[PDB]
């Protein structure tokens, strides 16, 4: 009779997987989006005799740090990181989140702001002169040429800090921004170094790594598993109902 | 009405009214004018929980069907009347894909409540043969 | 209603918005001075359900926690201000811009808008107007019997009279530059109005203080890259089909749930 | 009591009742869990109804003690 | 749907442009004829408020 | 998804090449004009790890 619960669990948790895939799948064409891969965990129910039941709890082990594929836009300050690279960004609460969105923007007052909550590099938020005409180099240096000055005045105005971290040592933080896992904090510290070997691809953006192929069979298997759970539930309740005649008379 | 019959029947009636709003909106998408001569303002239903006094829970009330305040997307036809200066017809603001998704959701909620009513009804028939 | 249906719904709406952007972008080829518009999306706040445990590292273990998340809300429609090509109209009153800058224009309601469009004309009174009668600021009034008009490379507009061997300097057609060009509020009719995201407008003569120069007889073209739009259309169509499949899968699962 | 599910959100910044960063708060119902809850509740109710009937039959045959 | 409306406007504008081109081309060898150029203009923009 | 963007980048490179060719060809019979050649370059490579 308690079998139904286990089956229920599976059904319920499968819906959660569906949910993940859906959010994983609507976010195609979202810049620099990291697909949230998902798994199902068996959960044994260690008890006093005959360990027979296991639950099907749903989980998201992390994000897929597979570089999405690049779109060439020729915009001077659209940035693409190399593999395992991250742009550091001052989060809403204030802490160094990490993103792959290189769609940098400038405000009227010269705040470099990957979609606002600005970008962090070599100091606080990067600031540039208001008539920016920004150019971003390969290693991260940012040079600015005021529009009405001779072009041999492109002296660098800042540097864009980049950080190397991937997969096991990075987790999403309830915003599009990633942080370290607090297991990679009794390690390379709270604030990472600049790692002067991560390169920048200028004029090119990165799209989401939402693999449609594995998502489509994610959904196919999810549907099939769900209706298998429904069959188990149906048989269990019919068993119990037809059983209930024992106690009468 | 017995208690659960009331709760589930209220769910069914609310879902039916939601489905009617969805059908009306979906059908009047791309409808230039109303009777008085006005954009067809798209409609929405707001679900309150029923039973305000006592236990604070149970059943759904959907009174006061209201108007969705999206901006009445415009088209340019300065040969058609009903266009102001800078000729712009008013062109209902119905989100068709939203209405299809809403229709499927309403149907599924409807069917779930049908199913709970079925199970509980079997239970009640068994109840009345209490003793005799 | 469960989260899967509405998440796929917001995916469908986002693809629809992207297609609206593309269609507008493609209709406005052959609109002088038009700037292509790019839709930028974003994910929504992830509803965490179970925080991850500790990586005991005794055995290689999956870091399983659980956060589901939702949504692909459109966060921006940027305007790419890159210089478009030029077309020769042979029209003396036409003008194109070399580099950053906009023409300031007085709207009927009294506010000042700005346009990167040069298809000028003259009203019956002689004032410079923009294909729609919007006065160009500061007002430039042409005498009645000008043989020819000339707008120089810094906007010094002058006319030639019958008899004078000298083009009386009749006006100055100065430009206006913004600190953040992308932030302008496009109100249609090829006009933008300045907002808090663009800063106050800085007015100056063309060629000075960062403003561009003026090319008479030429008009700027829309900088729409149709290859980008076609490939984006293919992307949008297939993403729409994928999200439609997601909705269908969730609906079928819900049907199977509600049968029993 | 009141269930402590994380109170799932949706995003409709055209509907009122959506706060800053427009999020309709959307009650947290695990639909399949509630389906199963009703299913099992009906089954247990039926079991107890039967127990009542069986005990009454036991007691009425208790009355026929002796005669 | 709005995309269809937008694309219909684009098709109408291109067909008006072709009409202007064809009128110019026909009237070659018409004395004193002054050619025509169609100047276009975008429509109003729908604003969606960010919370 | 993937090959779509790769081929779009290829299209953009070919279009830039055609634009430069067109500017070279139009500016023939312009005094002292020095012709232009566009050099291209492949983008960042992604490394898939072998266990």
UniProtKB/Swiss-Prot annotation, chain A:
It holds the Pfam family Flg_bb_rod. Its main location: other. One of its GO terms (cellular component) is bacterial-type flagellum. It is found in: Bacterial flagellum basal body. It comes from the Bacteria. The keyword 4Fe-4S does not apply. InterPro entries: Flag_bb_rod_N, Flagellar_basal_body_rod_CS, Flagellar_FlgE/F/G, Flg_bb/hook_C_dom, FlgE/F/G-like, LlgE_F_G-like_D1. One of its GO terms (biological process) is bacterial-type flagellum-dependent swarming motility. Belongs to the flagella basal body rod proteins family. This is Flagellar basal-body rod protein FlgF.
Swiss-Prot record, chain C:
It is found in: Bacterial flagellum basal body. The keyword Transport does not apply. The keyword Mitochondrion does not apply. GO terms for biological process: bacterial-type flagellum-dependent swarming motility. Signal peptide: none annotated. One of its GO terms (cellular component) is bacterial-type flagellum. Keywords: Bacterial flagellum. InterPro entries: Flag_bb_rod_N, Flagellar_basal_body_rod_CS, Flagellar_FlgE/F/G, Flg_bb/hook_C_dom, FlgE/F/G-like, FlgG_G_neg, LlgE_F_G-like_D1. Disulfide bonds: none annotated. Belongs to the flagella basal body rod proteins family. The basal body constitutes a major portion of the flagellar organelle and consists of four rings (L,P,S, and M) mounted on a central rod. The rod consists of about 26 subunits of FlgG in the distal portion, and FlgB, FlgC and FlgF are thought to build up the proximal portion of the rod with about 6 subunits each. This is Flagellar basal-body rod protein FlgG. The lineage of its organism: Bacteria, Pseudomonadati, Pseudomonadota, Gammaproteobacteria, Enterobacterales.
Swiss-Prot record, chain D:
It comes from the Bacteria. The keyword rRNA processing does not apply. GO terms for biological process: bacterial-type flagellum-dependent swarming motility. The keyword Cell membrane does not apply. It is found in: Bacterial flagellum basal body. One of its GO terms (cellular component) is bacterial-type flagellum. Its main location: other. Keywords: Bacterial flagellum. Transmembrane segments: none annotated. The basal body constitutes a major portion of the flagellar organelle and consists of four rings (L,P,S, and M) mounted on a central rod. The rod consists of about 26 subunits of FlgG in the distal portion, and FlgB, FlgC and FlgF are thought to build up the proximal portion of the rod with about 6 subunits each. Belongs to the flagella basal body rod proteins family. This is Flagellar basal-body rod protein FlgC. It comes from Salmonella typhimurium (strain LT2 / SGSC1412 / ATCC 700720). The gene is flgC.
Swiss-Prot record, chains E, F:
It is found in: Bacterial flagellum basal body. Transmembrane segments: none annotated. The basal body constitutes a major portion of the flagellar organelle and consists of four rings (L,P,S, and M) mounted on a central rod. The rod consists of about 26 subunits of FlgG in the distal portion, and FlgB, FlgC and FlgF are thought to build up the proximal portion of the rod with about 6 subunits each. Belongs to the flagella basal body rod proteins family. This is Flagellar basal-body rod protein FlgG. The gene is flgG. The chain holds residues 2 to 52 of 260 of the full protein.
């Amino acid at each position: 009779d308690h079998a139904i619960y286990t089956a229920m669990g599976a059904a319920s948790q499968t819906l959660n997987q569906q949910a993940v895939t859906a959010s994983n799948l609507a976010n195609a064409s979202t810049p620099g989006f990291r697909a949230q891969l998902n798994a199902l965990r068996a959960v044994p129910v260690d008890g006093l005799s005959l360990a027979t039941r296991t639950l099907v709890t749903a989980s998201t082990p992390g994000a897929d740090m597979t570089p999405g594929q690049l779109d060439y836009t020729s915009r001077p300050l659209d940035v693409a990181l190399q593999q395992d690279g991250w742009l550091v960004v001052q989060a809403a609460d204030g802490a160094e989140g990490y993103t792959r969105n290189g769609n940098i923007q400038v405000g009227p007052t010269g705040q470099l702001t990957i979609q606002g909550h600005p970008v962090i590099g070599e100091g606080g938020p990067i600031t540039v002169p208001e008539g920016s005409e920004i150019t971003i180099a390969a290693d991260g240096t940012i040079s600015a040429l005021n529009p009405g000055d001779p072009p041999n005045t492109v002296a660098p105005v800042g540097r864009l800090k980049l950080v190397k971290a991937e997969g096991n040592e990075v987790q999403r933080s309830d915003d599009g921004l990633f942080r370290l896992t607090a297991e990679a904090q009794a390690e390379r510290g709270a604030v990472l170094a600049a790692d002067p070997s991560i390169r920048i691809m200028s004029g090119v953006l990165e799209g989401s790594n939402v693999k449609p192929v594995e998502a489509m069979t994610d959904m196919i298997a999810n549907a099939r598993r769900f209706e298998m759970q429904m069959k188990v539930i149906t048989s269990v309740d019919e068993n119990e109902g037809r059983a209930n005649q024992l106690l009468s008379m | 009405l017995l208690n659960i019959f009331d709760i589930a029947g209220s769910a069914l009636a609310a879902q039916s009214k939601r489905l009617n709003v969805a059908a009306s909106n979906l059908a009047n998408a791309d409808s230039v004018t109303g009777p008085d001569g006005q954009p067809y303002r798209a409609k929405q239903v707001v679900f309150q929980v029923d039973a305000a006094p006592g236990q604070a829970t149970g059943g759904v009330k959907v009174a006061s069907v209201i108007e969705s305040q999206a901006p009445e997307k415009l088209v340019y036809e300065p040969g058609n009347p009903l266009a102001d200066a800078n000729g712009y017809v008013k062109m209902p603001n119905v989100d068709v894909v939203g209405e299809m998704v809403n229709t499927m959701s309403a149907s599924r909620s409807y069917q779930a409540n049908i199913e709970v009513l079925n199970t509980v009804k079997s239970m009640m028939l068994k109840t009345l043969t209490l003793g005799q | 209603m469960i989260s899967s249906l509405w998440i796929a719904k917001t995916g469908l709406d986002a693809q629809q918005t992207n297609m609206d952007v593309i269609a507008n972008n493609l209709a406005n080829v052959s609109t002088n001075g038009f700037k292509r518009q790019r839709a930028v999306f974003e994910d929504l706040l992830y509803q965490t359900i179970r925080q991850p445990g500790a990586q005991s590292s005794e055995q290689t273990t999956l870091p399983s926690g659980l956060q589901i998340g939702t949504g692909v809300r459109p966060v921006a429609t940027e305007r790419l201000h890159s210089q478009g090509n030029l077309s020769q109209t042979n029209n003396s009153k036409d003008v194109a811009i070399k580099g950053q800058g906009f023409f300031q224009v007085m709207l009927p309601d009294g506010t000042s808008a700005y346009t990167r469009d040069g298809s000028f004309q003259v009203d019956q009174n002689g004032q410079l107007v923009t294909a729609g009668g919007f006065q160009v600021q500061p007002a430039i009034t042409i005498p009645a019997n000008a043989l020819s008009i000339t707008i120089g490379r810094d906007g010094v507009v002058s006319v030639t009279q019958q008899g004078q061997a000298a083009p009386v300097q009749v006006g100055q057609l100065n430009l206006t530059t913004f600190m953040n060009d992308t932030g302008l509020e496009s109100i249609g009719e090829n006009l933008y109005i300045e907002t808090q995201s663009s800063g106050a407008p800085n007015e100056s003569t063309p060629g000075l203080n960062g403003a561009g120069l003026l090319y008479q007889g030429y008009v700027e073209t829309s900088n729409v890259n149709v290859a980008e739009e076609l490939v984006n259309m293919i992307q949008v169509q297939r993403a729409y089909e994928i999200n439609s499949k997601a909705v269908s899968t969730t609906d079928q699962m819900l049907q199977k749930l509600t049968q029993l």
